[PDB]
mmCIF file of C-alpha atoms in Angstrom:
data_model
loop_
_atom_site.group_PDB
_atom_site.id
_atom_site.type_symbol
_atom_site.label_atom_id
_atom_site.label_comp_id
_atom_site.label_asym_id
_atom_site.label_seq_id
_atom_site.Cartn_x
_atom_site.Cartn_y
_atom_site.Cartn_z
ATOM 1 C CA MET A 1 0.221 -0.115 0.175
ATOM 2 C CA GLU A 2 1.489 3.842 -0.809
ATOM 3 C CA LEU A 3 1.175 3.923 2.690
ATOM 4 C CA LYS A 4 3.192 7.656 4.863
ATOM 5 C CA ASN A 5 6.793 6.760 2.578
ATOM 6 C CA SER A 6 8.334 6.130 5.914
ATOM 7 C CA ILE A 7 9.462 4.524 8.656
ATOM 8 C CA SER A 8 9.998 8.231 11.208
ATOM 9 C CA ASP A 9 6.976 8.907 9.926
ATOM 10 C CA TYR A 10 5.073 5.754 11.427
ATOM 11 C CA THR A 11 4.540 6.158 14.915
ATOM 12 C CA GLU A 12 5.031 2.551 17.103
ATOM 13 C CA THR A 13 1.457 3.043 16.872
ATOM 14 C CA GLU A 14 -0.163 4.117 13.372
ATOM 15 C CA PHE A 15 2.077 1.025 12.546
ATOM 16 C CA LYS A 16 0.127 -1.407 14.786
ATOM 17 C CA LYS A 17 -2.432 -0.788 13.240
ATOM 18 C CA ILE A 18 -0.974 -1.647 10.642
ATOM 19 C CA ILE A 19 0.802 -5.369 12.056
ATOM 20 C CA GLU A 20 -2.627 -5.499 13.792
ATOM 21 C CA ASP A 21 -4.420 -5.017 10.493
ATOM 22 C CA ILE A 22 -1.875 -8.197 9.410
ATOM 23 C CA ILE A 23 -2.391 -10.442 12.107
ATOM 24 C CA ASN A 24 -6.332 -9.245 13.256
ATOM 25 C CA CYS A 25 -7.305 -9.965 9.092
ATOM 26 C CA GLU A 26 -9.136 -7.381 8.802
ATOM 27 C CA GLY A 27 -9.836 -8.565 5.122
ATOM 28 C CA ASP A 28 -9.433 -10.865 2.179
ATOM 29 C CA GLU A 29 -5.539 -11.779 2.613
ATOM 30 C CA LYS A 30 -4.906 -9.688 -0.013
ATOM 31 C CA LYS A 31 -5.192 -7.426 2.125
ATOM 32 C CA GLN A 32 -2.312 -8.553 4.392
ATOM 33 C CA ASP A 33 -0.299 -9.102 0.944
ATOM 34 C CA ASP A 34 -1.062 -5.821 0.988
ATOM 35 C CA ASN A 35 0.799 -5.197 4.037
ATOM 36 C CA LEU A 36 3.001 -7.291 3.739
ATOM 37 C CA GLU A 37 4.782 -4.958 1.286
ATOM 38 C CA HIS A 38 4.469 -1.858 2.873
ATOM 39 C CA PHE A 39 5.426 -3.909 6.056
ATOM 40 C CA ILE A 40 8.793 -4.150 3.823
ATOM 41 C CA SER A 41 8.702 -0.986 2.576
ATOM 42 C CA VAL A 42 8.564 1.848 5.075
ATOM 43 C CA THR A 43 11.400 -0.831 7.265
ATOM 44 C CA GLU A 44 13.773 -2.152 5.213
ATOM 45 C CA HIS A 45 14.059 -4.999 7.581
ATOM 46 C CA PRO A 46 14.613 -7.739 4.856
ATOM 47 C CA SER A 47 12.615 -10.191 7.076
ATOM 48 C CA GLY A 48 9.546 -8.728 5.626
ATOM 49 C CA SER A 49 7.047 -11.109 7.370
ATOM 50 C CA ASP A 50 9.488 -13.786 8.385
ATOM 51 C CA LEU A 51 8.841 -12.252 12.125
ATOM 52 C CA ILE A 52 4.666 -12.553 11.004
ATOM 53 C CA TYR A 53 4.946 -15.881 10.126
ATOM 54 C CA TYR A 54 7.677 -17.011 10.682
ATOM 55 C CA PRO A 55 8.338 -15.601 13.792
ATOM 56 C CA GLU A 56 11.429 -17.062 16.647
ATOM 57 C CA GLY A 57 11.690 -16.773 20.812
ATOM 58 C CA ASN A 58 12.082 -12.970 21.270
ATOM 59 C CA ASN A 59 8.907 -13.165 19.233
ATOM 60 C CA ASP A 60 5.094 -12.866 21.845
ATOM 61 C CA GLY A 61 3.596 -14.025 18.205
ATOM 62 C CA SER A 62 2.087 -10.293 18.749
ATOM 63 C CA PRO A 63 1.909 -6.874 16.627
ATOM 64 C CA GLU A 64 4.372 -5.832 19.882
ATOM 65 C CA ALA A 65 7.265 -8.195 19.347
ATOM 66 C CA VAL A 66 6.873 -6.858 16.049
ATOM 67 C CA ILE A 67 7.324 -3.293 17.114
ATOM 68 C CA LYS A 68 10.188 -3.989 19.132
ATOM 69 C CA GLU A 69 12.079 -5.933 16.197
ATOM 70 C CA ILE A 70 11.044 -3.144 14.213
ATOM 71 C CA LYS A 71 12.634 -0.365 16.627
ATOM 72 C CA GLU A 72 14.968 -2.687 17.769
ATOM 73 C CA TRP A 73 16.223 -3.729 14.482
ATOM 74 C CA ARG A 74 16.071 -0.555 12.631
ATOM 75 C CA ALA A 75 18.349 1.368 16.501
ATOM 76 C CA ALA A 76 20.839 -1.869 15.652
ATOM 77 C CA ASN A 77 22.098 -1.408 12.109
ATOM 78 C CA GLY A 78 21.751 3.006 13.372
ATOM 79 C CA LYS A 79 18.786 3.587 11.809
ATOM 80 C CA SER A 80 15.544 5.610 12.759
ATOM 81 C CA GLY A 81 12.701 4.318 14.156
ATOM 82 C CA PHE A 82 9.449 5.823 13.980
ATOM 83 C CA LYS A 83 8.810 8.753 15.502
ATOM 84 C CA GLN A 84 10.398 9.393 19.352
ATOM 85 C CA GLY A 85 7.098 7.742 20.673
#
């Protein structure tokens, strides 16, 4: 989706509504796919959907641990996470 063209225009909680969008499925699979491009796009986070469909043991499998790994990946990579919340 042609949403906020970067993570630093996201906040952690706007990204939650996208990340929750999918986990719930506010949609028809296709809506998750349309997110899932976007979830690469803003993030640069190389896994994409691997944090969502193949999650590991840091992961709570909720929208929380992905937001975390997006913060934590971006900052570990030296990059901007979302907004300063």
